[PDB]
């Protein structure tokens, strides 16, 4: 029931090794079975 997010930002699939450090452990406690990215459509 904890939705854990890890994140990392690299300047410049690139070769190399970089580990991801935990970001936010949310106590959502919900079922997650589908996922979909949401984008921003700038009218300008």
């Amino acid at each position: 029931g904890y939705f854990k997010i890890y994140s990392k930002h690299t300047p410049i699939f690139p070769q190399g090794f970089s580990a991801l450090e935990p970001l936010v452990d949310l106590p959502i406690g919900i079922n997650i079975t589908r996922f979909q990215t949401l984008l921003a459509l700038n009218r300008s």
């Binding site: 029931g1 904890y2 106590p27 406690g29």
Partner: protein, 49 residues
């Protein structure tokens, strides 16, 4: 309701608030405050961090 100022003690309106404690399968998120003590260094102490 008969909220008259001249009513008796048993008839005067009173504010009542009911608290419900619900335990669910989801992780608990409303816990009581935790008391903490001072910090003792360079001594054999029983600790809890």
């Amino acid at each position: 309701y008969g909220f008259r100022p001249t009513y008796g003690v048993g008839h005067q309106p009173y504010r009542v608030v009911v608290l419900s404690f619900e335990l669910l399968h989801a992780p608990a998120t409303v816990c009581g405050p935790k008391k903490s003590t001072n910090l003792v260094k360079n001594k054999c102490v029983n600790f809890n961090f």
